[PDB]
Amino acid sequence: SWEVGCGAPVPLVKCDENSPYRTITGDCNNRRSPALGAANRALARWLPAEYEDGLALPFGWTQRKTRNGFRVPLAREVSNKIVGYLDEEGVLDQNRSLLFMQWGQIVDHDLDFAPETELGSNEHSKTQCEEYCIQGDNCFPIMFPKNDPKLKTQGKCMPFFRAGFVCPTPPYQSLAREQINAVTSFLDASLVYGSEPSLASRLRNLSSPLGLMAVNQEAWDHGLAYLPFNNKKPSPCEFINTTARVPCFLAGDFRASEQILLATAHTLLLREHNRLARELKKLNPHWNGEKLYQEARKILGAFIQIITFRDYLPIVLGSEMQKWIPPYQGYNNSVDPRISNVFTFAFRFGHMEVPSTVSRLDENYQPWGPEAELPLHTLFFNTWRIIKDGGIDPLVRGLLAKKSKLMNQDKMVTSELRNKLFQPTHKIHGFDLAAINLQRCRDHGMPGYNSWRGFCGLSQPKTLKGLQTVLKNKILAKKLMDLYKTPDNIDIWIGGNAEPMVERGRVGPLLACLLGRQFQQIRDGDRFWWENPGVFTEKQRDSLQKVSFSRLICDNTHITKVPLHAFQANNYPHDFVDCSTVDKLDLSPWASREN
Ligand code: HEM
Ligand SMILES: *[C@@H]1O[C@H](CO)[C@@H](O[C@@H]2O[C@H](CO)[C@@H](O)[C@H](O)[C@H]2NC(C)=O)[C@H](O)[C@H]1NC(C)=O
Ligand SMILES: *[C@@H]1O[C@H](CO)[C@@H](O)[C@H](O)[C@H]1NC(C)=O
Ligand SMILES: *[C@@H]1O[C@H](CO)[C@@H](O)[C@H](O)[C@H]1NC(C)=O
Ligand SMILES: *[C@@H]1O[C@H](CO)[C@@H](O)[C@H](O)[C@H]1NC(C)=O
Numbered sequence: 001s002w003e004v005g006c007g008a009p010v011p012l013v014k015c016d017e018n019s020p021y022r023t024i025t026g027d028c029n030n031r032r033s034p035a036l037g038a039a040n041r042a043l044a045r046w047l048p049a050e051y052e053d054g055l056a057l058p059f060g061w062t063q064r065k066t067r068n069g070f071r072v073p074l075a076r077e078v079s080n081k082i083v084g085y086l087d088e089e090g091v092l093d094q095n096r097s098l099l100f101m102q103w104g105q106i107v108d109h110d111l112d113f114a115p116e117t118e119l120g121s122n123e124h125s126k127t128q129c130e131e132y133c134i135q136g137d138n139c140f141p142i143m144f145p146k147n148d149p150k151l152k153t154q155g156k157c158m159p160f161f162r163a164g165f166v167c168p169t170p171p172y173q174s175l176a177r178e179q180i181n182a183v184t185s186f187l188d189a190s191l192v193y194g195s196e197p198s199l200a201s202r203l204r205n206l207s208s209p210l211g212l213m214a215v216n217q218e219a220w221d222h223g224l225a226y227l228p229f230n231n232k233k234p235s236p237c238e239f240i241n242t243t244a245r246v247p248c249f250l251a252g253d254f255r256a257s258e259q260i261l262l263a264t265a266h267t268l269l270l271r272e273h274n275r276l277a278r279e280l281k282k283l284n285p286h287w288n289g290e291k292l293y294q295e296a297r298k299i300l301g302a303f304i305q306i307i308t309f310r311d312y313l314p315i316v317l318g319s320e321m322q323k324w325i326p327p328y329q330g331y332n333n334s335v336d337p338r339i340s341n342v343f344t345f346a347f348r349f350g351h352m353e354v355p356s357t358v359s360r361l362d363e364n365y366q367p368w369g370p371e372a373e374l375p376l377h378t379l380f381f382n383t384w385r386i387i388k389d390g391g392i393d394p395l396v397r398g399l400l401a402k403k404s405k406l407m408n409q410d411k412m413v414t415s416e417l418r419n420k421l422f423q424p425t426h427k428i429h430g431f432d433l434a435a436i437n438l439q440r441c442r443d444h445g446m447p448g449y450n451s452w453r454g455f456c457g458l459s460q461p462k463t464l465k466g467l468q469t470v471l472k473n474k475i476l477a478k479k480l481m482d483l484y485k486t487p488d489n490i491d492i493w494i495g496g497n498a499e500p501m502v503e504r505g506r507v508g509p510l511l512a513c514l515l516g517r518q519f520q521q522i523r524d525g526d527r528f529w530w531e532n533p534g535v536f537t538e539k540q541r542d543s544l545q546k547v548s549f550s551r552l553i554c555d556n557t558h559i560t561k562v563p564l565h566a567f568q569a570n571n572y573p574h575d576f577v578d579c580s581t582v583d584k585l586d587l588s589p590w591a592s593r594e595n
């Protein structure tokens with residue numbers, strides 16, 4: 001009646017509602033509707049898609065087609081006129097560590113991923129955009145505006161391919177196009193363990209019966225483990241230094257080597273699983289491999305949940321934390337736990353938190369080596385700088401002692417991302433993440449800024465002066481009106497990120513509402529939430545309350561000096577303490593069974 005009843009994923013999945021553990025795919029979390037929150041299904045629509053033709057074609061696709069009577073601006077022009085800035089001085093966050101930015105990317109990768117269509121590049125399909133910039137089908141290139149420097153140096157466009165959609169692949173009709181979420185919507189450490197059975201098994205050490213995750217066999221970090229290499233060619237991590245020839249890492253998530261501090265974070269997370277699996281073997285020598293894997297996995301998922309909801313979200317949402325995410329009251333099976341399409345743009349706020357450089361620091365937290373600080377763009381797809389140039393310990397100290405970029409209406413996105421982004425199969429450090437984000441909003445059929453203001457119960461500015469009051473910025477509002485002609489047409493990514501930040505937070509009201517709702521739903525709609533009665537024992541839960549990121553670092557590096565509050569801006573040695581000061585995770589309550 002209402003829909004075509006589309007069933008894209010393998011419709012066949014057996015549940016076994018006895019099981020104490022999550023599935024890898026996210027299936028069977030919800031008993032009534034077992035596909036809810038599972039990978040490889042459509043992103044949720046909180047509002048109906050808005051396409052130029054009602055169905056599929058992004059706004060901007062057809063030159064003569066207006067949105068509400070006006071042409072949508074070129075995404076790269078928006079980027080150049082609004083998002084870009086020259087001066088990196090004065091741009092850092094005096095009260096957020098670089099680790100704050102990094103955790104955000106980690107959580108994001110746990111929750112959502114809308115891969116571009118035709119997930120493996122075949123033949124010369126992509127001579128369309130890359131070579132000749134011809135818009136057609138899934139080819140939706142980002143065209144340069146006149147007077148853009150990149151015109152002189154790089155050609156007429158940046159290539160951009162449309163995101164994958166559910167029912168068919170290249171064709172579709174009789175319904176609006178719905179993009180795919182290829183990972184589980186639950187905050188479940190899927191970035192570590194995988195979202196498909198297949199990857200999930202390849203990541204494991206099945207050779208031993210200790211419940212370990214596979215580790216690198218070709219390299220070590222003062223004996224501490226690295227992730228296995230992904231030996232798929234062609235490797236971007238190889239392409240960026242064919243002399244080192246150090247390939248990308250293989251992780252539960254495809255994007256783990258996009259930048260060195262993300263690869264770093266994934267490495268910490270792997271070690272913690274192996275560490276937990278060893279402690280569980282000691283206490284329970286009678287537990288088999290499978291038991292040890294699941295129980296470690298379960299602890300690790302709880303860890304990410306706690307860090308996120310107890311430490312991270314409060315200092316993102318600030319004053320609005322309590323409004324959108326009140327204290328836990330138990331699993332509710334009527335709550336939809338699926339990630340919305342809009343959320344996958346709202347969480348891009350992190351793009352304005354990425355600074356232009358990364359530092360390696362020694363044990364006195366001083367520059368590590370002559371080239372301790374590096375431009376961010378030299379670190380995309382960069383594994384060799386880990387394997388061959390100090391392991392993760394120096395980078396982790398940088399995450400603690402260096403600062404995030406602060407979002408700034410006059411300095412939104414560093415040119416390292418806005419001009420120097422590298423993407424696989426594109427060969428150059430010359431893309432623009434901002435422009436991509438805006439093109440993707442259109443690709444995904446996003447409602448515009450005032451639709452979402454309306455959704456969130458917020459005023460909907462119609463005039464320049466209305467917009468000035470909401471943004472509390474006259475020039476920004478003017479540039480936005482010059483480009484969009486109406487606030488109704490402002491892309492959600494830029495509109496949302498334009499708004500001044502809420503007290504004690506790092507996003508504005510609109511984003512706090514959109515993020516706040518999504519996270520509430522992730523928690524309340526999850527049958528395996530760590531605090532749901534039955535998931536963990538009383539005593540297990542008492543031990544998990546004492547997890548911290550500080551302690552993750554101590555147990556999984558050879559770092560012995562850490563802050564107590566790692567997401568804060570911390571200066572060494574004053575704000576730093578010895579590792580012995582810090583609570584450990586007490587695994588006693590996982591002792592087989594009591595006397
Ligand atoms: C150097 C750091 C980072 C790089 C290089 C980076 C790069 C990227 C790229 C290339 C995409 C895909 C763009 C597209 O095709 O539409 C992306 C998407 C995204 N990024 Fe970032 N990003 C970074 C940091 C962050 C941070 C700090 C956050 C959040 C706090 C974040 C959240 C997201 C999200 C949610 C997506 C959409 C994922 C999806 O559902 O497909 N990123 N990022
Ligand atoms: C590619 O990686 C190599 C190392 O794998 C980098 O060079 C090493 O780095 C410096 C170069 O001055 C020295 O320690 C060694 O002489 C280099 N080793 C080798 C094998 O040459 C090199 O700079 C990297 N290139 C890029 C562009 O990243
Ligand atoms: C810095 O951030 C934390 C939030 O976690 C807050 O408790 C602390 O008071 C802040 N410092 C400032 C800006 O006063
Ligand atoms: C798996 O387990 C054994 C014992 O710890 C170890 O020696 C072996 O190298 C591991 N295999 C991989 C690839 O992680
Ligand atoms: C559960 O969640 C929905 C929100 O989607 C709410 O309307 C409903 O009252 C809740 N019911 C329970 C069981 O608390």
Ligand SMILES: [Ca+2]
Nearest residue numbers: 110184186190
């Ligand atoms: Ca997940």
